[PDB]
Write a protein that binds this ligand. Structure first.
Ligand SMILES: *[C@@H]1O[C@H](CO)[C@@H](O[C@@H]2O[C@H](CO)[C@@H](O[C@@H]3O[C@H](CO)[C@@H](O)[C@H](O)[C@@H]3O)[C@H](O)[C@H]2NC(C)=O)[C@H](O)[C@H]1NC(C)=O
Ligand SMILES: *[C@@H]1O[C@H](CO)[C@@H](O[C@@H]2O[C@H](CO)[C@@H](O)[C@H](O)[C@H]2NC(C)=O)[C@H](O)[C@H]1NC(C)=O
Ligand SMILES: *[C@@H]1O[C@H](CO)[C@@H](O)[C@H](O)[C@H]1NC(C)=O
Ligand SMILES: *[C@@H]1O[C@H](CO)[C@@H](O)[C@H](O)[C@H]1NC(C)=O
Ligand SMILES: *[C@@H]1O[C@H](CO)[C@@H](O)[C@H](O)[C@H]1NC(C)=O
Ligand SMILES: [Ca+2]
Length: 573
C-alpha cells in the first residue's frame, strides 16, 4: 500500500549439494515491524509476543551470522529488512575464509586469505531478506521505532521475493526454475589483428563482484577499483605511440570469476580445445558449437602468451611509515619473474612524487586469482599477481555492500594508473612518456564505485539501478541466448571504443548496419575487442529437452533461481 522501490533482495542460489540465500513464501511475507538497533532491543526480541508475524528491522551493526541466527522466537520471524542509513562500525565479510579454494591451485590449502569472514552469505534462509536505500532506511527506522510504544494502529511490511528454484541445481535445472551463474568476459588489443608471430603480454583482472545483497555489489577493492584502473591504463595507452612495441598486449576482463573462475577457465579451454564443426556464412561465427565471435581462434595462440599480469585488489595499498609510501604486493609464479618485477620496482621509483612502492609476499601459495586458471596449464611463463596484501586481505569488507568508495584509496589511483601504464609500455618494448588521462579517471572512478551514470552516450538503455553492481548474474537460457547486465555491456562498449582503430560516418542506427564493426551514434567503429562466454564447464545444453544439464559436478555448479518480481510494501496494521 506504499511500495518502496529502491529495495535490494537476498536471492536464492542453488549448488550441487544444496542452496543458499533467501526466498519469500509463495504470496510473500508480512508482519509487524520490530527494530533491533541496540543490545536492549536485541535482547527484548526473545520475550516479545505481541504478535505472531514479525518483520525484523536491523541496524546493520546487528546484521551478521551470529546475531541473526540467534533470533529464536516463539513468534516466527517472517522477514528481515536491513537498514543502510548507517554503516557497520567494524570489519565484516559474509563471504568465505578462502574464496574459491577448491577451484584454484590449492584445493587442500590451510591458509585463510579472508580470515575475518563469517560466511553468512552461504546460509539457506526460509524467509526473505531485503536491504533498502539510505532515504528509505531513514523512514523505516523511524516507523519501526515508533512501534515500540505498543499500541496497535502500528506499522508493518510485506516482502515479496518468491524464488522458483529450490533444493539443488539438478532439481531446479530439470524444472527450468534456475539458470547457470555466468556471463560474458571481454578482451581487447590495440592491434587491428594480432601478429601471430609476436609474443603476447596478457594483462587481466576479474571484474565481477559478490555481496549478500547482489544489487549492491560495488566491490570497490574486490574488483572495481582495479577495473577502473585497467580501463584508465588502456585509455592512457591509447594516446601513446605504440609503434615501438615488439610484443602484443591483450587486456582481459574476466566475468563470473567469483564463482569458480569460469570466465578464465572457459576462455583457456577454447584456446586449447575449440573446434568448430559448422561455421556461419563468412565464418565469423560458429553455429556448432555456438560461438558468437571466432576472433579468439583466429588470433590468439595460447602458447604465445609469454607474460601474465593480474590486478587483484589494489585499492587499499598499505601505508609504510618508513618510506612514506603505500605498498602493493607482488605474488609471483611461473618462471623468470624477477625480470618482470624488477621493471615494476623501477617504474615505481622513477619519479619523486610516487606514493606507491612494491613489496614481495611472504606467502608460498598464490592468493585466489584468475592466474590460477593459466597455471593449471603452464608453468613456463612469468605470472605476477598484484594485490594490496601480503597474506590476510587488506579489504575489510570482502564480498559485502560496504566495499564501496569509502573502502578504497582514491588518492592512489593516479599513481597506480601511471605506474602500470608505464610498466606495460616498457615490457611491451616501448619507451614512451606516459600522460595519464585524468579527465577519464575522474569520470570513471565515481562511475564504478558510487553511481554508474557515466558514458551513457555509448549505451542504448539507462540503468535501472544506479548503484554500480558487478555480480555476474546468469549466463542465459541457452548457449544461443546469452544475457548480460548493464555493467557488462558498458564495460564492453567503453573498452571497444577506447581501443578503436577506425571510425566512419555511416548514419548507422544499429550494430547490424556495420560490417565487422559496431554502431556508435551514426559511426561504424572498428576495434579488436570481443565478448567471450564465461560459464562452468560442468554444464551442457540439451536442445532435446531444451534444458541445462549437469554433465560434470567437479566443475563449479552454481545456478541462480528464476523469479517473477520483487517488492517491498509498508502499511499500517
Ligand atoms: C555481529 O554482530 C553483533 C551485534 O552487534 C556483535 O556483537 C556485539 O559486539 C559488540 C562489541 O563486541 C558488543 O558491544 C560491547 O558491549 C560491551 C558490554 O555491553 C561494551 O563494554 C562495549 O563497549 C561494547 O559496547 C555488543 O554487546 C555485542 N552484542 C551482542 C548482542 O552480542 C558481534 O560482535 C558481531 N560479530 C561479528 C563476527 O561481527
Ligand atoms: C603457437 O605458438 C607456438 C609457440 O611459438 C608454436 O609452437 C611452436 O612452433 C615454433 C616453431 O614454429 C617453435 O618455436 C616452438 O618450439 C613450437 N612449440 C610447440 C610446438 O609448442 C606454434 O606454431 C603455434 N601454434 C600454431 C597453431 O601455429
Ligand atoms: C546517508 O546519507 C546521509 C545524508 O546524506 C549521510 O549523512 C550518511 O552518511 C549516509 N549514510 C551512509 C551509511 O551512507
Ligand atoms: C610533486 O608534488 C609537489 C606537492 O604537490 C608539487 O608541488 C610538485 O610540483 C611535484 N613535483 C614534481 C617534481 O612533480
Ligand atoms: C570432470 O572434470 C574434471 C575437472 O576438474 C576433469 O578432470 C575430469 O576429466 C572430468 N571427468 C569427467 C566426468 O569426464
Ligand atoms: Ca556489425
Amino acid at each position: 500500500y506504499t511500495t518502496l522501490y529502491s529495495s535490494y533482495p537476498c536471492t536464492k542460489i542453488m549448488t550441487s549439494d544444496g542452496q543458499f540465500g533467501c526466498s519469500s513464501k509463495h504470496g510473500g511475507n508480512s508482519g509487524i515491524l520490530y527494530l533491533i538497533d541496540d543490545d536492549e532491543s536485541y535482547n527484548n526480541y526473545f520475550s516479545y509476543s505481541q504478535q505472531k508475524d514479525i518483520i525484523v528491522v536491523l541496524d546493520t551493526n546487528y546484521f551478521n551470522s551470529t546475531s541473526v541466527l540467534n533470533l529464536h522466537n516463539k513468534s516466527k520471524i517472517e522477514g528481515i529488512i536491513v537498514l543502510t542509513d548507517t554503516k557497520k562500525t567494524y570489519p565484516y565479510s559474509p563471504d568465505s575464509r578462502y574464496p574459491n579454494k577448491i577451484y584454484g591451485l590449492y584445493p587442500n590449502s590451510n591458509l585463510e586469505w579472508n580470515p575475518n569472514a563469517d560466511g553468512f552469505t552461504y546460509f539457506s534462509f526460509p524467509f526473505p531478506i531485503f536491504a533498502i536505500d539510505n532515504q528509505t532506511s531513514v523512514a523505516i527506522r523511524n516507523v519501526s521505532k515508533h512501534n515500540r510504544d505498543g499500541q496497535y494502529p502500528a506499522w508493518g511490511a510485506e516482502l515479496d521475493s518468491f524464488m522458483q528454484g529450490a533444493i539443488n541445481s539438478e532439481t531446479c535445472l530439470r524444472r527450468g526454475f534456475c539458470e547457470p551463474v555466468g556471463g560474458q568476459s571481454i578482451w581487447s588489443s590495440f592491434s587491428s589483428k594480432i601478429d601471430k608471430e609476436k609474443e603476447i603480454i596478457l594483462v587481466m583482472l576479474p571484474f565481477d563482484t559478490t555481496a549478500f545483497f547482489r544489487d549492491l555489489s560495488i566491490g570497490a577493492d574486490q574488483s572495481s577499483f582495479a577495473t577502473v584502473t585497467l580501463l584508465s591504463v588502456i585509455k592512457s595507452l591509447a594516446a601513446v605511440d605504440r609503434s615501438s612495441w615488439n610484443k602484443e598486449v591483450v587486456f582481459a576482463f574476466w566475468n563470473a570469476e567469483r564463482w569458480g573462475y569460469v570466465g578464465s577457465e572457459y576462455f583457456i579451454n577454447d584456446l586449447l580445445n575449440f573446434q568448430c564443426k559448422t561455421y556461419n556464412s563468412d565464418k565469423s561465427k560458429c553455429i556448432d558449437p555456438p560461438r558468437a565471435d571466432l576472433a579468439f581462434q583466429t588470433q590468439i595462440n595460447f602458447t604465445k602468451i609469454s607474460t601474465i599480469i593480474e590486478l587483484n585488489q589494489i585499492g587499499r595499498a598499505q601505508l609504510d611509515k618508513n618510506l612514506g609510501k603505500y605498498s602493493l604486493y607482488l605474488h609471483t609464479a611461473g618462471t623468470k619473474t624477477s625480470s618482470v618485477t624488477d621493471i615494476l620496482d623501477q617504474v615505481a621509483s622513477s619519479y619523486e612524487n610516487s606514493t606507491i612502492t612494491f613489496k614481495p609476499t611472504t606467502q608460498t601459495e598464490l592468493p585466489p586469482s584468475s592466474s590460477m586458471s593459466f597455471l593449471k596449464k603452464t608453468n613456463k611463463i612469468p605470472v605476477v599477481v598484484i594485490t594490496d596484501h601480503d597474506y590476510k586481505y587488506s579489504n575489510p569488507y570482502y564480498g559485502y555492500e560496504q566495499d564501496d568508495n569509502e573502502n578504497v584509496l582514491g588518492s592512489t589511483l593516479n599513481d597506480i594508473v601511471y605506474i602500470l601504464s608505464t610498466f606495460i609500455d616498457r615490457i611491451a618494448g616501448g619507451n614512451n612518456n606516459i600522460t595519464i588521462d585524468k579527465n577519464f579517471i575522474n569520470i570513471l572512478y565515481p562511475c564504478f564505485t558510487s553511481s554508474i551514470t557515466c558514458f551513457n552516450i555509448l549505451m542504448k538503455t539507462y540503468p535501472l539501478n544506479e548503484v554500480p553492481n558487478f555480480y555476474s548474474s546468469v549466463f542465459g537460457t541457452s548457449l544461443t541466448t546469452t544475457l548480460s547486465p548493464y555493467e557488462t555491456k558498458l564495460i564492453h562498449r567503453l573498452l571497444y571504443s577506447i581501443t578503436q582503430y577506425n571510425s566512419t560516418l555511416t548514419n548507422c542506427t544499429s550494430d547490424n548496419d556495420c560490417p565487422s564493426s559496431l554502431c556508435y551514434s551514426g559511426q561504424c567503429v572498428s576495434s579488436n575487442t570481443h565478448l567471450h562466454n564465461a560459464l562452468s564447464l560442468g554444464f551442457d545444453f540439451d536442445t532435446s529437452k531444451n534444458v541445462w544439464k549437469i554433465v560434470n559436478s567437479s566443475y563449479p555448479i552454481f545456478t541462480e533461481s528464476n523469479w517473477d518480481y520483487t517488492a517491498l510494501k509498508v502499511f499500517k496494521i
